[PDB]
Design an enzyme around this catalytic site. Structure first.
Site, PDB file in Angstrom:
ATOM      1  N   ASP A  17      64.570 -20.170 -19.220  1.00  0.00           N
ATOM      2  CA  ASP A  17      64.515 -19.619 -20.437  1.00  0.00           C
ATOM      3  C   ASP A  17      62.267 -19.421 -19.993  1.00  0.00           C
ATOM      4  OD1 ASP A  17      63.517 -18.147 -22.537  1.00  0.00           O
ATOM      5  OD2 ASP A  17      64.015 -19.888 -24.278  1.00  0.00           O
ATOM      6  N   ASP A  62      59.981 -18.432 -22.576  1.00  0.00           N
ATOM      7  CA  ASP A  62      60.041 -18.848 -24.067  1.00  0.00           C
ATOM      8  C   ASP A  62      58.763 -19.948 -23.917  1.00  0.00           C
ATOM      9  OD1 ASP A  62      60.210 -19.732 -26.584  1.00  0.00           O
ATOM     10  OD2 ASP A  62      62.206 -20.532 -26.362  1.00  0.00           O
ATOM     11  N   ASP A  68      63.328 -24.333 -23.343  1.00  0.00           N
ATOM     12  CA  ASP A  68      61.831 -24.790 -24.095  1.00  0.00           C
ATOM     13  C   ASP A  68      62.687 -24.975 -25.418  1.00  0.00           C
ATOM     14  OD1 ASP A  68      61.557 -22.309 -25.738  1.00  0.00           O
ATOM     15  OD2 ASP A  68      61.220 -21.813 -23.140  1.00  0.00           O
TER      16      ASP A  68
HETATM   17  O1  LIG Z   1      62.248 -15.219 -30.631  1.00  0.00           O
HETATM   18  C1  LIG Z   1      61.129 -15.852 -30.595  1.00  0.00           C
HETATM   19  O2  LIG Z   1      60.162 -16.559 -30.683  1.00  0.00           O
HETATM   20  C2  LIG Z   1      60.602 -15.680 -29.379  1.00  0.00           C
HETATM   21  C3  LIG Z   1      60.578 -16.240 -28.007  1.00  0.00           C
HETATM   22  O3  LIG Z   1      62.268 -16.881 -27.981  1.00  0.00           O
HETATM   23  O4  LIG Z   1      61.642 -14.184 -28.995  1.00  0.00           O
HETATM   24  C4  LIG Z   1      60.168 -13.075 -29.743  1.00  0.00           C
HETATM   25  O5  LIG Z   1      59.398 -13.142 -29.751  1.00  0.00           O
HETATM   26  C5  LIG Z   1      58.613 -12.904 -28.747  1.00  0.00           C
HETATM   27  C6  LIG Z   1      57.318 -13.354 -29.550  1.00  0.00           C
HETATM   28  O6  LIG Z   1      56.776 -14.373 -29.881  1.00  0.00           O
HETATM   29  C7  LIG Z   1      58.673 -11.635 -28.409  1.00  0.00           C
HETATM   30  O7  LIG Z   1      57.972 -10.826 -26.526  1.00  0.00           O
HETATM   31  C8  LIG Z   1      60.132 -11.120 -27.787  1.00  0.00           C
HETATM   32  O8  LIG Z   1      60.361 -10.350 -27.432  1.00  0.00           O
HETATM   33  C9  LIG Z   1      61.284 -11.450 -29.177  1.00  0.00           C
HETATM   34  O9  LIG Z   1      60.656 -10.533 -30.010  1.00  0.00           O
END
Ligand SMILES: O=C(O)[C@@H](CO)O[C@H]1O[C@H](CO)[C@@H](O)[C@H](O)[C@@H]1O
Ligand SMILES: O=C(O)[C@@H](CO)O[C@H]1O[C@H](CO)[C@@H](O)[C@H](O)[C@@H]1O
Ligand SMILES: [Mg+2]
Lengths: 251, 252
Positions: free
Chosen positions: A6, A8, A202
């Protein structure tokens, strides 16, 4: 061995890679160990991070393969073949409209926001926010902490599924990291290479990824889920740790 | 006599149309009584309604005059002269980011939303939503009820001012319907005409309007502000009633 990760906070966390993580990544590459990103991010985002397929995007909504993958699967698209596992974004957005009616309150997501708004809320640049808005399967929601539960019940009521990605709730149907990992393993050209899968995540909510691999490693803060390994430190040092300790002594 | 009136919830019906108010407005015009919209709406919305200057937009953020207004003020813009009373939208939007950091949660406004989302949220057409997004001074906030208390305190903490237009909270700095009406009355070409002012309104942002006039009439739902006149029915029917019962007798 295949390593599923991931982005993340496993590989990225601090924006992109970072000293220790890179070193560990090269190490894997040098050993001929395939590394497959499995992420909430869009294909546009992953491409911008310079990653080559195969990779899994939007929480398992889409599996992107090189166009010339030895196993014929998915729909051809330029230099890719795409395996769609989840409903398309437009359909998810339409169901969200039904959900709003049920919840009797607005349900906002990236589709409703400008790129500058998404950038402000995520800490991304406007450019990266535009790529994060280019969603094919999964919608990132912007919910009031106080109304999360009413919204989630409405989502399920209209046939949608939800997950938590680290900071935001997501809505989709058919997007699951474990399903996507199992699919890619079943599509792997050499069955022996895919026989042993590693999954590094993570999030205490990466269970689907953790369930779908043979060796699961949680590289975050606090205790791992049951049946999942841990690391002393989170971040790139946690990724490097896990790589040096759990993986290298297998190759 | 000049009649200063809110639009939404006052002169406009529940669907944003002038139709029902037409007869009352026509009485005022025949009697030569000026009617001045004092609204949360933007200039583009007021124009789309076919309304002519002078008018006051965005909770008193901007005063729009005819280009040939006898009293020189503001700055030229084709057929208009504009008197800016409040901070520009860009400055409010930047300050809102500090409010958001302080609240520790997102504070969304129209500026963050597509026209399509604003349309969905307001019930406006997509085209009307583009007009509502064309804001010069004031931001319309889209807040969930549970976060309002925390949000409004964060706004105050960062030096922004807040109000409410009947359906939405707003944030601005220097935008006040009473301040704007007072400025317009002072710019009025006929001091005798401007000596007695009437104010009709229905929402929080109209309390300042009520204080800036000589005869205040509340046509909102529920009980009126302390010492303010009320009508049997709200909105445009309240407006018509006020004209016929409160204003006509005074014009004779
Ligand atoms: O849900 C989240 O906290 C993050 C990581 O899991 O994803 C979103 O947020 C990210 C930005 O922090 C984007 O890059 C992803 O496309 C999505 O919108
Ligand atoms: O606050 C509200 O209740 C209304 C009152 O006029 O104004 C907002 O909402 C209206 C749509 O309902 C817009 O036309 C305005 O520009 C503004 O955004
Ligand atoms: Mg109103």
């Amino acid at each position: 061995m295949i390593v599923f990760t991931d982005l993340d906070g496993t590989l990225l966390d601090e924006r992109g890679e970072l000293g220790p993580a890179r070193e560990a990544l090269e190490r894997l590459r040098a050993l001929g160990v395939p590394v497959v990103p499995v992420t909430a991010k869009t294909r546009k985002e992953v491409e911008a991070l310079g990653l080559e397929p195969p990779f899994i995007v939007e929480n398992g909504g889409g599996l992107y393969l090189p166009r010339d993958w030895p196993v014929r699967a998915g729909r051809p698209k330029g230099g890719y073949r795409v395996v769609s596992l989840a409903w398309p974004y437009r359909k998810v957005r339409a169901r969200l409209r039904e959900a709003e009616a049920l919840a009797g309150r607005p349900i906002l997501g990236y589709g409703d926001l400008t790129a500058e708004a998404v950038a402000r809320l995520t800490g991304l640049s406007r450019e990266a926010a535009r790529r994060a808005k280019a969603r094919e399967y999964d919608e990132t929601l912007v919910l009031c902490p106080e109304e999360v539960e009413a919204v989630l019940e409405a989502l399920e009521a209209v046939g949608l599924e939800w997950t938590h990605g680290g900071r935001f709730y997501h809505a989709a149907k058919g997007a699951d990291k474990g399903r996507a990992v199992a699919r890619l393993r079943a599509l792997w050209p050499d069955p022996e290479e895919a026989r042993f899968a590693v999954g590094l995540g993570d999030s205490l909510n990466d269970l689907p990824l953790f369930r779908a691999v043979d060796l699961a490693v949680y590289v975050g803060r606090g205790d791992p889920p049951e049946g999942v390994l841990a690391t002393p430190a989170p971040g790139p040092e946690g990724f490097r740790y896990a790589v040096e300790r759990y993986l290298l002594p297998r190759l």
